[PDB]
C-alpha cells in the first residue's frame, strides 16, 4: 500500500481488582485500519502483559501529518531481522509526508537487504532538520542553489506508433 499513520491506544479491560487500567498508545504505520490494530497487539505482546482479550483498543485515529508541502528530511530508526541477523539500523529519506517516508523505507529496505516487511520494526520516526542528517545521499540534496541538469523524462517508449517513422533523437538540443 502506502502506509498511512495511526495512533492506537490500549486499555487492559478493567477487571474488578483494578478498575482504570492505564491506557498506553502507539504510532503505527499500516496500509489499512484493521492491520494497524494488529500491529498494536504484536507490539503489545512485548512490553505489557496484556493480550486480546485481556485488553481493548480505545480510540484510534489516522493522522494526517502537519505540513504536507514542506521538504523535511526524515530520519527513521529501525530494527530488522536478517537471515541470521537481527540488527539495528538508522536510515534517512526526504519526503513531504511521514507515511511517505516510511513506505520509502520499506521498498528500499526490502530491496537493498531482502528484508521482508514482517521482519522490520519501526522504533522511531522523526523529522531531522539539516546538519544532523548523516547519510550522504540526503545531504547532497541540500545546497540551494542546486543546478543539476539531468535532462530527465521517462521518455515514453515509444509513442502511439509501434512502427514509428521518426527516430527519437533524445537530447533535443
Amino acid at each position: 500500500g502506502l502506509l498511512k499513520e495511526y495512533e492506537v491506544v490500549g486499555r487492559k479491560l478493567p477487571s474488578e481488582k483494578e478498575p482504570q487500567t492505564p491506557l498506553y498508545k502507539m504510532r503505527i504505520f499500516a496500509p489499512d485500519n484493521i492491520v494497524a490494530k494488529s500491529r498494536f497487539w504484536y507490539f503489545l505482546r512485548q512490553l505489557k502483559k496484556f493480550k486480546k482479550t485481556t485488553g481493548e483498543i480505545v480510540s484510534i485515529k489516522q493522522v494526517y501529518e502537519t505540513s504536507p508541502v514542506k521538504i523535511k528530511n526524515f530520519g527513521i530508526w529501525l530494527r530488522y531481522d536478517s537471515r541470521s541477523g537481527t540488527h539495528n539500523m538508522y536510515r534517512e529519506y526526504r519526503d513531504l509526508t511521514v507515511g511517505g517516508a516510511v513506505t520509502q523505507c520499506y521498498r528500499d529496505m526490502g530491496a537493498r537487504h531482502r528484508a521482508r516487511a514482517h521482519s522490520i520494526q519501526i522504533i522511531k520516526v522523526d523529522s531531522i532538520p539539516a546538519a544532523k542528517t548523516r547519510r550522504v545521499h540526503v545531504k547532497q540534496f541540500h545546497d540551494s542553489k542546486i543546478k543539476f541538469p539531468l535532462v530527465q523524462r521517462v521518455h515514453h517508449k515509444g509513442n502511439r506508433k509501434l512502427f514509428s517513422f521518426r527516430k527519437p533523437r533524445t537530447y533535443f538540443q
Binding site: 542553489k145 535532462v151 523524462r153 521517462v154
Partner: protein
Amino acid sequence: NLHLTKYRIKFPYTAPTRIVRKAWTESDLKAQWKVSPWSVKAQNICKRSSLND
C-alpha cells in the same frame, strides 16, 4: 513527467506561492510564452487536434 523549457525565474527556494505568483507575472511569462518559437507548435493541440468534420 515534466519536460523543461528555457525559462528560469528568480525566487528564494523557500518561497510561498504568493511570491512565486508575484514573480510569475513580474518577469512577464504569460505574454512571451504564447509566442515561444515552438509554442506555436503547441497549437496543433488547439487547431490540428480534432479539427472537426
